[PDB]
């Protein structure tokens, strides 16, 4: 069968891919001094018209993410120069090895790296946050990922599928004329539609290139396979440009723009949203009009799932410690309810679980929404996959998720119709830009500062608020809350500078077409055109500070003083081996023990309320 | 008398000046990839701290517009590359002749002109109006001067004279802090005050450079002229940074920022406004407090007129 042939042709070793990186630079050199959003449009166009393309063994859905797959795409405008600085280590290192062709290793080191030096997002942000960049790089307090770009959004496919890219091209053209009729006082809006036009043309032409390759392969091929490649030629002539009418046409639509998006936006978390909800009209029509059968539909979805394994991240040696496990995470969201609370599981939901269960590959990140009204069969079928060790599902509980969104002031209907992207991030589907992994914060470092008067306990870094030496438990709590605050403020300042930096040196016009309100308002996504705009920042170490508080509580209670406990910590419990055993014996978060897990809860609430009050640039 | 000595020392032939053009490029190379408004601030600062300066024959108001006067300032970010393309014709042409030092003619042709090629205002606008650029260049229907930059504004001197540039520096600093306290969601506003800070510092330091030259010339000078240069040292230490209190202090204020503005903005129409209205408080106070007399006041204004 077909899946078996497809599974084996993405198990070969991964490479460092360079063709996107090169052609991007090539266009950017041709375009210097032009309006940056037009430069980004023209660059994306140039890569889509000139990247080597290939249809693979027995494929029904085409669109390689990079030429000759498993690989890493390089984004030197973001954080791709990190990896050039370590080219020697890439084929022989223990995790996420990438073969590097030494002929294009020379092209990176003396053609790419000297050009993009000081043309990056980080180059914009540096003079504006030099004190933050310094403490970012110590690796100890937070990481800020918007250096690398934004991404992290489930793409609005139903917006796209109801229009098609020939609509955008023509609408951009009507809007360019009307702007000219009023004398172009709205220059920004004008640049936008100019970019949109260009970027639509690119995507139309990109589908057309795969149509031509399909035709070229079919005058050289036999029987059923020749029938398939002729269909692929016919489909890719029509869609990404027209509204699709069949299920195969829909799935080929989404994957073309999905692969396209990966040439403009960096590798993290560009997701497909509630794919079971929006492919279902095409599916239901095709079955029972005889157009397709259940096994063909399966193979179509299988092909899509399998193709998202073509990317593997361009992480250097340090980024491999903080993001280990080849994290890219094109997510997919199945199941859940409608905007009324009714169960929205359909036959395509089940199908998608099955292909997930069979494939057991690292990618797509499949996210399953369940709630109190999910069908019992579906929960059984989820439990069967998980218990048989599939290890590739995540479960999202609607009740808690829509409550979270309603407090973030999301509309009823937009919260009910939520999507997921990345790992665990939630968002209104299709009309939001949430920068869902914009930072990660070491809240343990807050506690460390909180008992050492804003100094790192073992490194001498004065990065914390200037609190005092702590005495009792109660005034370590105040000192803790103040320190969390201080650290959050550091990342909100940092991420905002970076978000302005993205808006200025890396607007992303294709992605803008895919995120609602952007195209209609004529403002790019990185400038805030999405209906909802958020910046997701993450707490790490919430149980470590929670548990340290319980352990401080009892240790003071019976016997010891505060000065002991900090000195124990500074000295790594060497010379403090009695107390250390009492600390270790203390109640821990994870055991249903209120006296322990109340502290962790409180730490999270402090964090949450310190974050949710700040506004972002967008 | 003093006017006669001043009149004759701006009647010499004009040159193509290059020092602003060079130091601008020098800073812009150090600053690539930074926020453009900060780059412009840092460039202006670099030229004001490093341009050759000179006090001239019998001057009371100092601040040469370019080193070694009558000359042209080059703005390659605007329309200064037009003139590099015709360097040969400049010393020998019938109107507006400019001597070009052939050592810095080499610096324009292969250091300035290849850098600013496609970093200009026109390079931004071209892909967005290619049909207009085509009919602009036929010379027949219109000319559009904003290729060269904007300028054309009478500068608000009374706004400036009521604050002084140390006010701006400090206020920018209060405003930078308050923006940081609210997490810098207003990035643009933040870039602005960052630029303002830098640009205020530049102007304060620029007055200070002329104060130091005045002091340096006066330990080498005799009698009345030594009295004058010591006054100029005292005035340029105080103003462009503080609010002026005397008429001489006011007129030296306006001319320093006036010469400064000409290093940032292109040569057209940077004006001084209702100068008779806003210099009159300092004038009325000084006459009848005996501070100055009518003939000194005349010479002060004469110096300003002559410097433009």
TrEMBL record, chain A:
Keywords for the protein's UniProt record, in alphabetical order: Lyase, Organic radical, Pyruvate
Cellular component annotations (GO), alphabetically ordered: cytosol
Gene Ontology molecular function: any one: lyase activity
PFL domain mapped to chain residues: 1-618
Name of the protein this chain belongs to: Pyruvate formate-lyase 2 (PflD)
Organism: Archaeoglobus fulgidus (strain ATCC 49558 / DSM 4304 / JCM 9628 / NBRC 100126 / VC-16)
Residues of the full protein shown: 4 to 621 of 776
């Amino acid at each position: 069968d077909r899946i078996e042939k497809l599974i084996k042709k993405v198990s070969k070793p991964a490479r460092l891919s360079v063709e996107r990186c090169r052609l991007y630079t090539e266009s950017m050199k041709q375009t210097e001094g032009e309006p940056m959003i037009i430069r980004q449009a023209k660059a994306l166009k140039h890569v889509l018209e000139n990247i080597p393309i290939q249809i693979l063994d027995s494929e029904l859905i085409v669109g390689t993410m990079l030429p000759n797959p498993p690989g890493a795409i390089i984004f030197p405008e973001g954080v791709g120069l990190r990896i050039i600085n370590e080219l020697d280590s890439l084929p022989n290192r223990e995790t996420n090895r990438l073969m590097v062709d030494e002929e294009d290793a020379k092209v990176l080191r003396e053609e790419i790296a000297p050009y993009w030096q000081r043309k990056t997002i980080e180059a914009f942000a540096f003079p504006l946050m030099p004190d933050i960049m310094q403490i970012l790089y110590t690796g100890s307090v937070f990481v800020l990922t918007e250096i690398a770009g934004i991404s992290h959004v489930a793409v609005n496919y139903p917006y796209l599928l109801r229009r098609g890219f020939r609509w955008f091209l023509e609408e951009s053209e009507r809007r360019i004329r009307a702007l000219e009729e009023s004398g172009v006082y709205e220059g920004e809006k004008y640049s936008f539609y100019q970019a949109a036009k260009i970027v639509s043309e690119a995507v139309i032409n990109y589908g057309l290139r795969y149509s031509k390759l399909a035709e070229e392969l079919a005058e050289s091929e036999d029987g059923e396979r020749r029938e398939e490649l002729l269909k692929i030629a016919e489909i890719c002539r029509k869609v990404p440009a027209e509204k699709p009418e069949t299920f195969w046409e829909a799935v080929q639509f989404v994957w073309l723009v999905q692969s396209a998006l990966h040439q403009e936006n960096y590798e993290q978390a560009i997701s497909m949203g509630r794919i079971d909800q929006y492919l279902y009209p095409f599916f239901k029509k095709d079955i029972g009009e005889g157009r397709i059968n259940r096994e063909l539909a399966f193979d179509i979805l299988a092909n899509l799932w399998i193709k998202t394994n073509e990317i593997v991240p361009a992480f250097d040696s340090l980024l491999e410690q903080y993001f280990s496990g080849q994290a890219t995470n094109q997510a997919v969201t199945i199941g859940g309810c409608d905007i009324y609370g009714n169960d929205a599981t359909n036959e395509l939901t089940y199908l998608m679980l099955e292909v997930t269960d069979r494939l057991r590959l690292r990618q797509p990140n499949v996210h399953v929404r369940i709630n109190k009204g999910s069908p019992e069969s579906f929960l059984k079928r989820l439990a069967e996959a998980i218990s048989s060790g599939c290890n590739n599902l995540a479960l999202f509980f609607d009740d808690a998720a829509v409550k979270a969104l309603k407090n973030a002031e999301v509309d009823d209907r937009d919260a009910l119709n939520y999507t997921t992207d990345g790992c665990v991030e939630i968002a209104p589907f299709g009309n939001s830009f949430t920068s869902s992994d914009a930072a990660l914060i070491n809240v343990a470092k807050a506690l460390e500062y909180a008992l050492n008067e804003g100094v790192d306990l073992q490194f001498g870094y004065e990065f914390g608020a200037k609190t005092e030496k702590p005495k009792f438990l109660e005034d370590l709590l105040e000192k803790l809350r103040e320190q969390v605050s201080h650290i959050v403020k550091l990342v909100v300042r940092g991420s905002n500078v970076l978000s302005y930096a993205n808006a200025e040196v890396k607007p992303t016009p294709l992605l803008s077409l895919c995120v609602e309100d952007c195209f209609e308002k004529g403002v790019d996504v990185s400038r805030g055109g999405a209906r909802y705009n958020f910046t997701g920042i993450q707490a790490v170490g919430i149980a470590d500070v929670g548990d340290s508080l319980v352990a401080i509580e009892g240790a003071l209670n019976a016997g010891y003083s505060m000065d002991d406990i900090v000195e124990a910590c500074r000295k790594n419990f060497v010379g403090y081996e009695k107390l250390h055993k009492l600390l270790l014996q203390s109640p821990k978060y994870g055991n249903d023990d209120d006296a322990a897990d109340k502290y962790t809860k409180m730490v999270l609430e402090w964090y949450c309320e310190e974050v949710n009050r700040h506004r972002n640039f967008r």
